Amino acid sequence: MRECISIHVGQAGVQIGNACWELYCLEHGIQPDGQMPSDKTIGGGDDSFNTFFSETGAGKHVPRAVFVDLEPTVIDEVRTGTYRQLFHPEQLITGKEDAANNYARGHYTIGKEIIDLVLDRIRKLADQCTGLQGFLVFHSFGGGTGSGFTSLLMERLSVDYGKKSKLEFSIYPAPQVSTAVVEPYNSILTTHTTLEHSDCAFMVDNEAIYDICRRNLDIERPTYTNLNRLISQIVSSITASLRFDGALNVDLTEFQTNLVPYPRIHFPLATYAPVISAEKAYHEQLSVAEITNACFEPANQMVKCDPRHGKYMACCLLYRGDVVPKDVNAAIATIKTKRSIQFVDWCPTGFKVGINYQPPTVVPGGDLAKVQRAVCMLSNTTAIAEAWARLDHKFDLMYAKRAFVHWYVGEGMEEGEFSEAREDMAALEKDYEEVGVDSVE
Amino acid sequence: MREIVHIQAGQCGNQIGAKFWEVISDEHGIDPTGSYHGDSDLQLERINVYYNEATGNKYVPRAILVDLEPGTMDSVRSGPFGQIFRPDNFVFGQSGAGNNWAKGHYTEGAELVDSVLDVVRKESESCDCLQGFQLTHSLGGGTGSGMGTLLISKIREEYPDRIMNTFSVMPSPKVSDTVVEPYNATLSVHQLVENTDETYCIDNEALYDICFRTLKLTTPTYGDLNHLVSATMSGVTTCLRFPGQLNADLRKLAVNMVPFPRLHFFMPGFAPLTSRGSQQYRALTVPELTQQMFDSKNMMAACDPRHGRYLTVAAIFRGRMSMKEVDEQMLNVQNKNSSYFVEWIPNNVKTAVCDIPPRGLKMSATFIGNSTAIQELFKRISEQFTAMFRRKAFLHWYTGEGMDEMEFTEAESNMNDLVSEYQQYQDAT
Amino acid sequence: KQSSISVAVRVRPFTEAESNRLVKIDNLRKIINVVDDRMLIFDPPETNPLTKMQRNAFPNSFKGSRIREHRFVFDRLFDEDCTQDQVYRNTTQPLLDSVLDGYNATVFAYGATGCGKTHTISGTPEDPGVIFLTMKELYNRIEELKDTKIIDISLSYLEIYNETIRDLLNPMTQCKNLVIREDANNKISVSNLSRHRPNSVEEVMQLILEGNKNRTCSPTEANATSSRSHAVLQINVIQKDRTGDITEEHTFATLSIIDLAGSERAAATKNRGARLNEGANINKSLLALGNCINALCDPRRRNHVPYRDSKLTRLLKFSLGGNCKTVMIVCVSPSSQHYDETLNTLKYADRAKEIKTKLIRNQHN
Ligand SMILES: CC(=O)O[C@H]1C(=O)[C@@]2(C)[C@H]([C@H](OC(=O)c3ccccc3)[C@]3(O)C[C@H](OC(=O)[C@H](O)[C@@H](NC(=O)c4ccccc4)c4ccccc4)C(C)=C1C3(C)C)[C@]1(OC(C)=O)CO[C@@H]1C[C@@H]2O
Ligand SMILES: Nc1nc2c(ncn2[C@@H]2O[C@H](COP(=O)(O)OP(=O)(O)OP(=O)(O)O)[C@@H](O)[C@H]2O)c(=O)[nH]1
Ligand SMILES: Nc1nc2c(ncn2[C@@H]2O[C@H](COP(=O)(O)OP(=O)(O)O)[C@@H](O)[C@H]2O)c(=O)[nH]1
Ligand SMILES: Nc1ncnc2c1ncn2[C@@H]1O[C@H](COP(=O)(O)OP(=O)(O)O)[C@@H](O)[C@H]1O
Ligand SMILES: [Mg+2]
Ligand SMILES: [Mg+2]
Numbered sequence A: 001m002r003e004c005i006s007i008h009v010g011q012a013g014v015q016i017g018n019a020c021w022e023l024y025c026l027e028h029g030i031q032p033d034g035q036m037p038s039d040k041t042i043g044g045g046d047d048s049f050n051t052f053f054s055e056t057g058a059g060k061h062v063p064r065a066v067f068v069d070l071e072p073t074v075i076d077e078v079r080t081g082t083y084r085q086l087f088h089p090e091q092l093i094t095g096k097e098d099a100a101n102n103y104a105r106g107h108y109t110i111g112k113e114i115i116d117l118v119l120d121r122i123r124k125l126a127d128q129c130t131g132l133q134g135f136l137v138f139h140s141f142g143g144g145t146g147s148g149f150t151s152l153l154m155e156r157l158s159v160d161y162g163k164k165s166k167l168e169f170s171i172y173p174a175p176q177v178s179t180a181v182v183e184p185y186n187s188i189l190t191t192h193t194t195l196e197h198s199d200c201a202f203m204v205d206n207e208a209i210y211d212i213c214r215r216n217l218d219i220e221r222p223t224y225t226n227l228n229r230l231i232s233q234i235v236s237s238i239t240a241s242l243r244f245d246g247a248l249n250v251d252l253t254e255f256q257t258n259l260v261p262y263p264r265i266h267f268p269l270a271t272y273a274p275v276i277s278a279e280k281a282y283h284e285q286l287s288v289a290e291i292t293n294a295c296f297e298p299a300n301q302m303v304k305c306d307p308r309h310g311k312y313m314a315c316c317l318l319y320r321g322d323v324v325p326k327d328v329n330a331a332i333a334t335i336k337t338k339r340s341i342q343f344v345d346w347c348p349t350g351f352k353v354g355i356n357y358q359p360p361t362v363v364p365g366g367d368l369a370k371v372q373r374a375v376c377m378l379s380n381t382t383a384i385a386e387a388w389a390r391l392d393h394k395f396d397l398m399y400a401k402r403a404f405v406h407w408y409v410g411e412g413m414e415e416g417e418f419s420e421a422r423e424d425m426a427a428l429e430k431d432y433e434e435v436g437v438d439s440v441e
Numbered sequence B: 001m002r003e004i005v006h007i008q009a010g011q012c013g014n015q016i017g018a019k020f021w022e023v024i025s026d027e028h029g030i031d032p033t034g035s036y037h038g039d040s041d042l043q044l045e046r047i048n049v050y051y052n053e054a055t056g057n058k059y060v061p062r063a064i065l066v067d068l069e070p071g072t073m074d075s076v077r078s079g080p081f082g083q084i085f086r087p088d089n090f091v092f093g094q095s096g097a098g099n100n101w102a103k104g105h106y107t108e109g110a111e112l113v114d115s116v117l118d119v120v121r122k123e124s125e126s127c128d129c130l131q132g133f134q135l136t137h138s139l140g141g142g143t144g145s146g147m148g149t150l151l152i153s154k155i156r157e158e159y160p161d162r163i164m165n166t167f168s169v170m171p172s173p174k175v176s177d178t179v180v181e182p183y184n185a186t187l188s189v190h191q192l193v194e195n196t197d198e199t200y201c202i203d204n205e206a207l208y209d210i211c212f213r214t215l216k217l218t219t220p221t222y223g224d225l226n227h228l229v230s231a232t233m234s235g236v237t238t239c240l241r242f243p244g245q246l247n248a249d250l251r252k253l254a255v256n257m258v259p260f261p262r263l264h265f266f267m268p269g270f271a272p273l274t275s276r277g278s279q280q281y282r283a284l285t286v287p288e289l290t291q292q293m294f295d296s297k298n299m300m301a302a303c304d305p306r307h308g309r310y311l312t313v314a315a316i317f318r319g320r321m322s323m324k325e326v327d328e329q330m331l332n333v334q335n336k337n338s339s340y341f342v343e344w345i346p347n348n349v350k351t352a353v354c355d356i357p358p359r360g361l362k363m364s365a366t367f368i369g370n371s372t373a374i375q376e377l378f379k380r381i382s383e384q385f386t387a388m389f390r391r392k393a394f395l396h397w398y399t400g401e402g403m404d405e406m407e408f409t410e411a412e413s414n415m416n417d418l419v420s421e422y423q424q425y426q427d428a429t
Numbered sequence C: 001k002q003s004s005i006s007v008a009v010r011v012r013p014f015t016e017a018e019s020n021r022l023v024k025i026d027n028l029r030k031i032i033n034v035v036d037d038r039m040l041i042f043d044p045p046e047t048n049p050l051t052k053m054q055r056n057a058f059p060n061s062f063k064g065s066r067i068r069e070h071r072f073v074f075d076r077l078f079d080e081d082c083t084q085d086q087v088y089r090n091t092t093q094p095l096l097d098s099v100l101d102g103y104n105a106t107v108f109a110y111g112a113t114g115c116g117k118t119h120t121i122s123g124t125p126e127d128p129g130v131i132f133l134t135m136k137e138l139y140n141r142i143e144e145l146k147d148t149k150i151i152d153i154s155l156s157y158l159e160i161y162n163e164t165i166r167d168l169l170n171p172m173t174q175c176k177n178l179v180i181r182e183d184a185n186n187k188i189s190v191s192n193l194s195r196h197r198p199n200s201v202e203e204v205m206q207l208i209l210e211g212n213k214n215r216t217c218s219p220t221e222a223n224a225t226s227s228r229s230h231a232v233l234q235i236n237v238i239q240k241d242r243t244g245d246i247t248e249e250h251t252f253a254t255l256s257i258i259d260l261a262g263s264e265r266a267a268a269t270k271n272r273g274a275r276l277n278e279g280a281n282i283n284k285s286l287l288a289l290g291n292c293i294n295a296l297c298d299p300r301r302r303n304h305v306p307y308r309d310s311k312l313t314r315l316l317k318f319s320l321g322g323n324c325k326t327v328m329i330v331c332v333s334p335s336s337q338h339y340d341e342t343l344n345t346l347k348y349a350d351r352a353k354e355i356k357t358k359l360i361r362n363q364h365n
Helices: A010-028 A072-079 A103-109 A115-127 A145-160 A183-194 A206-215 A224-242 A252-259 A288-295 A325-336 A384-399 A415-435 B010-027 B070-078 B101-107 B109-124 B142-158 B181-193 B204-213 B222-236 B250-257 B286-293 B323-336 B372-389 B405-426 C016-026 C049-055 C084-091 C093-101 C117-121 C130-144 C201-213 C274-297 C311-315 C317-321 C336-352
Strands: A003-009 A053-055 A061-063 A065-068 A132-140 A165-172 A200-205 A269-272 A312-321 A351-356 A373-381 B002-009 B051-053 B059-061 B063-067 B090-092 B129-138 B163-170 B198-203 B265-271 B310-318 B349-354 B364-371 C006-011 C032-036 C039-042 C070-073 C076-078 C105-111 C149-161 C164-167 C230-241 C251-259 C325-332
Touching (some): A003 A010, A010 A061, A010 A065, A010 A145, A065 A115, A103 A145, A103 A183, A132 A145, A132 A224, A132 A252, A145 A165, A183 A384, A183 A415, A200 A206, A200 A224, A200 A252, A200 A269, A206 B323, A252 A312, A252 A351, A252 A373, A288 A312, A288 A325, A325 A351, A384 A415, A415 C274, B002 B109, B002 B142, B010 B059, B010 B063, B010 B070, B063 B070, B063 B109, B070 B090, B090 B109, B101 B142, B129 B142, B129 B250, B142 B163, B163 B181, B181 B372, B222 B265, B222 B310, B250 B310, B250 B364, B265 B286, B265 B372, B286 B310, B286 B364, B323 B349, B372 B405, C006 C084, C039 C336, C076 C084, C084 C130, C093 C130, C093 C251, C105 C336, C117 C130, C130 C201, C130 C230, C130 C251, C149 C201, C149 C311, C325 C336
Parallel strands (some): B002 B063, B063 B090, B129 B163, B163 B198, C006 C076, C105 C325
Antiparallel strands (some): A312 A373, C032 C039
16 A cells, blocks of 8 residues: 655666665565465465565566666676566666766766656556655766766656655765766766755765774675665665554655755765674674664764764664663663764754564675664764765866866766856755854844 | 677787687687687677677677788688688788888778778677777887778767777887887877777887786797787776676776876786796785786886876776775775875776686786876877988888878877876876 | 957847746846946846845845856947947957958857857848958958058858868868868968958858858757857958068958857757757867866966867967957857856856967068
8 A cells, every 4th residue: 555666776776776675575575586475374464565566466576666777787687687587577778878977978868768768667667556655766976877867867756746755875975985086076966956856865875884894794805785785774674664563653754854954955874773793793782772872873874974073953763673662762861961962953852763563684695693673873964064075175176177077068068067066065065054053042 | 788899900900809809709608610618608698799690609700800911811810710700801902001101091091991991881780789999900010000090080980979999009118110110100199199089008018028027928929918918908898798796888987087088098907917836826815906906017008107197097807806895905005106196186096896707817907097107108209200200211101102291290299289288287286 | 569358248139939928027037237338247136026025034044046146347248239230340340450450360259059149240131240241341441442552362261060170162072181280380271271262242242151051050949040060260361562662561361250159058958869969069169168268367277278179279279379369259148047058158258358368460571
């Protein structure tokens, strides 16, 4: 009855989606071929909820997902993988050529000739949805497709569906680590064209997750599989309230209401506290208070910033498993007494709490321990302003020389648009500076 | 399905191409008969990038073999893999260009370019989507220089929106193999800057130095130089035909590495390279791969990066490895060697990772650098050029073929402008 | 001896549709307030009463819009109601006086698409532009100087299209045979141009009309007749004395008139395919020109000016390098719908006011 449509854009989006749908299938008992063997014990039962999986007459469960990367390699890895029989064959490739880390290509030149097909498939998938809530868009700043085509898709979805929630899971560029030299241009242009259309953008950083895996999980050499598994756990924590019973439910429209004070500052950070190996799962209690304290440690944040350099505007704590509301109350009360954790005066409330009975799954072949309770946190802070400013400085250092700019104007873009984007980014910075100021009367 | 059309011009281009088709055919499990006998199923799923299917699961290279001396074509035919090439793609004349750029560009090459372009059009229009062309040739020789530049110009006219990939052997600093090397090299560079997206500069003395110093070879024939170059050419397009954690096609490399349109002359490298005996003493890991990869002594262009600044480098890894190691190493190299990277590009390293290593290796890496030190190449040629052009040392062999002195002057001016631009971006803040 | 590059700005009038919408809304907004011949205000304040009422009770809590106008100063400004003669008298007549004195000169048009560059330079049969007036006055002054000096005109007219040169007065000449070659003294010397020799107003205007007929032009939804090429007209005027005592006082000069294709915005355009490719090439050429402007303005970049990034900048090298008086006509559209592009066309123009060159009178024989 409830449902949401996941959209995976680019290589990062597709691989995160692979992790996410592996986790979902394990959570609901779906086999890789789409069959649910739990029907052999409880015929007609509901272990696979139709928030994500559409059921056919034969008993096959089809995920409500759309995959796009403008390149055949990543999707072809799915079509010949272990989950080839799960997804509908309409996994979309306009890969006659990729975007080449170019915003213009994935938005103006090659982003067209696929957009109509993608929106047609999204329309077909939504027409089966009796009570669609919103879209979960997975992409990455810095790529060609993930920036440009995601901006175009968000622009078209804002017209086709209007006041429908559009949550984004985006890979922010790291302060130091990067795999391309044109990440600032793509990120700035994406943000400029995306601010007016998204409702809430959950942000993670690969460098921070590398640090988390190194310190907490004792993985010296993590690949993207570990990062995608952690992001999958976070997404599962966010969407658990639509699927399983709980003491306190959270709908998809609740996140934007609670985490977004003003329209232009909808950039919360995400973190997942009980990241621990099986060996270190012993020797600790992993109580509600300890995990909630771990949520607020700067070391455990998944965006390379420090909340201590700013003020908390909003916080949303989603609990899973053997969690009692009294313990959550005591933990948040303990957090509110810390002088190192500041909140803006215009928000004396701060916290939202959700509680769910379903604990997380083990994902065999993974690295996380089987903890019997867990917490995800979504925190909107002003410290993210720093993470913006660095990009802006980087942008300037290139744009003063017009480095790599000809690749963008060679695909239909006008030079002045660069400046216009940067200016919109300046205003955004100022907005943060105006938001985190003590009021007077 | 991205597809590449491969053009071979001159003796040097043809030998490099023969070795390269040997390497690629071994990579995809294609035998000298054109039939498949490999093991992995990933070898066929992107065979279309370089091969066409003919009848009996026979795979024919999408190669075009060009020369003006018939001997090279007979040498290619009688080689181990001479029987896989399409017989109609052997386009060749009778008399060579005479180590004369004008003969191969205006007089002799002009009479044979039409057949080559007919074959190019036949091969290019038989693809679902052409990614681009790649040409292997040499500067400092008649047929390679002249025909390669003429073909590049005409293909650019016909196909302005596709990638052009020139793997070229430049004149060497100490010893030359032609008396009139500076004229051909200057005119070739003048034609290359205006009609190519990326040029991979190779120098024979750098390859000799690598073979003697690193591989401990005492008789490095041209087969070994072709081996090294062929490994580089395979490394460049690895992500086009195999899956990986982080892909990168030719256009992405061109976008990330060419900050300004005319600065597209690159310095390649390959790792690991060890002697047959010293392999057992070395642990093959990413920290060692990147250490060898960024070494000044491993570059293939005989131009020291340490005399300039890197505008942008690209590293393409192959094999199962962690992303954290690659990111940390490409950050540590920049942090430790910050004086050798331009400070107005915040991140000078492009990274790509492919999951399928070469056949006998567990790990490999390909370097493609773009640095201002490449000016030391052009400057040298320019000096030699003017030393011959002041006295008109050999001009009557070129003006006798219909060339004007204005072409020489324009080529010299263009190369000097390129040198000036490189010097500007070296000394900047 | 120094000479600065003068910048004149022209504001085109509203189209019929835009005029209707703006007039109804005012009863859409004019965003360029021409307050003086040398001074305009871009997006002036107090021209939107709803914004005034909202900001009067919104003390800078958030921006949501522009906070402060832009103030621009140029050599001369032309409003919507200007005619062709006023532009001609104050933009290029001194340049013709200079070319007939012995100093090279150029006038070139820049701006966004649909701003009135071809109208300013070429015009229409019922409203001639700069070229018609300039040639008419040139030949009139020739008739004035008859029996005192011998004046010879050599006319050349080419276009840059997709980084290829075409001779507008001699079609069927292949693009491969038109190449730019710098000699030992850095003279441009485009190869294989017609170099026609008119001797009357009727001949020169017929020749120029035949040239204009061969320009590449197609609809692009910004205007039904959009130029897709950079058109360059060169007029070499050579003056000899009739005394017979021929000395170094023989003179020769060049008047250049250049119409540039317009910048196409990406966020607000519907041009897909070959039109978009042409716009991409035009944008590349204009970016190269902008790089040349920035390099010439900055003392720190004097080691290298990227003239060779495009053929347009190479043909414009002579103007900015030395020995030429330069006029830039910057065309703008005064509407909020074109807020973004216009700003850039103003901002670039501002930088272009800082270029200075050295002029030397030409002598021959
Ligand atoms: C221990 C072992 O198995 O022997 C190795 C070997 O000893 C070393 C020294 C090999 C060896 O290479 C050389 O001896 C050599 C000689 C001249 C020029 C270049 C190399 C080797 O020949 C090369 C050969 O490499 C391959 O098979 C790659 O897949 C390579 N193949 C070809 O080039 C090829 C040549 C002819 C016919 C078919 C394929 C390749 C590299 C990059 C991209 C695609 C393919 C390997 C593993 C070895 C030997 C056999 C000794 C090295 O080769 C490369 C380029 O990978 C040289 O340093 C490396 C590291 C290896 O340890
Ligand atoms: N966390 C995570 N990040 C990834 C993964 N794959 C790619 N990325 C990141 O994605 C960023 C760039 O995006 P791309 O890999 O180029 O994908 P894209 O957005 O489709 O760009 P194009 O391939 O050019 O179309 C890089 O900074 C990578 O670190 C992944 O599996 N997990
Ligand atoms: N790497 C490599 N270079 C070669 C080879 N043969 C010739 N060369 C180089 O090519 C140049 C000679 O040009 P060449 O191709 O023989 O002239 P052409 O036959 O008229 O085209 C010299 O500078 C050589 O160093 C080869 O087999 N391998
Ligand atoms: N000052 C002006 N007066 C009257 N019409 C004008 C003026 N400027 C532009 N126009 C109109 O704009 C239309 C298209 O302008 P055009 O000059 O072709 O654009 P571009 O400058 O891009 O070539 C013409 O039909 C012309 O009538
Ligand atoms: Mg991709
Ligand atoms: Mg026009």
